[PDB]
Amino acid sequence: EMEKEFEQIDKSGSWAAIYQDIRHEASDFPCRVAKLPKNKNRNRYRDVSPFDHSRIKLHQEDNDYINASLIKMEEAQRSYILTQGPLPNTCGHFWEMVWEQKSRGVVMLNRVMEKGSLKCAQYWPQKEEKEMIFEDTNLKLTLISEDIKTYYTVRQLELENLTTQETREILHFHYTTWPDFGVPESPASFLNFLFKVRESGSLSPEHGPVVVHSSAGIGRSGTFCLADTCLLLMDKRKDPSSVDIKKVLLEMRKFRMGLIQTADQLRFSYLAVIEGAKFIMGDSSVQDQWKELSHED
Amino acid sequence: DEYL
What we know:
The structure holds 2 protein chains of 2 kinds.
Chain A: H1 2-12, H2 15-24, H3 32-35, E1 55-57, E2 65-73, E3 78-83, H4 91-101, E4 105-108, E5 113-114, E6 117-118, E7 132-134, E8 139-148, E9 152-161, E10 166-175, H5 187-199, E11 210-213, H6 219-237, H7 245-252, H8 263-280, H9 286-294
Parallel strand pairs in A: 3-11, 4-10, 4-11
Antiparallel strand pairs in A: 1-2, 2-3, 5-6, 7-8, 8-9, 9-10
Chain B: no helix or strand
């Protein structure tokens, strides 16, 4: 049992060590296009870029670069598009990609201003009377509703392709209490937030990939996707004892760098998967218990 | 500019 390895690891204080090892055994594919002089301003951090083999391309003959890389999971059968927090100049590309990839859900695991620093652009309207019009990519985004909770908030945006005058409802999940280089207040708060997103049909195969992100799109985003993916496997296999987190993390770092950035984030990913397993393993009554513990009211 |  993973719960074995976990109590074993914690006991010996091996989280930082193991983490050094995951870092050490981690893939490294080139990021040529990111580093192109021209794309310099299409990137928030000079040290976080998309492997060109997994990068997502804007369907424009102009410049198809967007710091974002499609993670495609085969066994779990799930794809996610982790991307960094759009910059002032790139919120058009962010919605262009969302439209092209056919997503139906966005997951923001960060705050626009954290510990007094700008981490991500206010890429979506906050008031229904003020829509946004992305000139460069010809899109209109508008707030339709907003369901504010304790530590998170869902929104229903309406993305309209000013070109085909086609419209789509983008649900938006926003975690607002996951600190930069931090962990969720609790496995409960996290899994509660996770399941909400699940139920909304956003993670549904019938749509494009969910666009997940934080300020850089590797730390809190890797932690969200890892827990979701492991649980996914545990379900299908129905044999939980076979899911190796380190292996699944490593499999994901093939598609995009730095997934998960702190030993404690790794450790947390174990708690989330273990806790949540309980719900996969019939204990349906656990789902509601999480909502209670999350204090999402 | 640098995150890591």
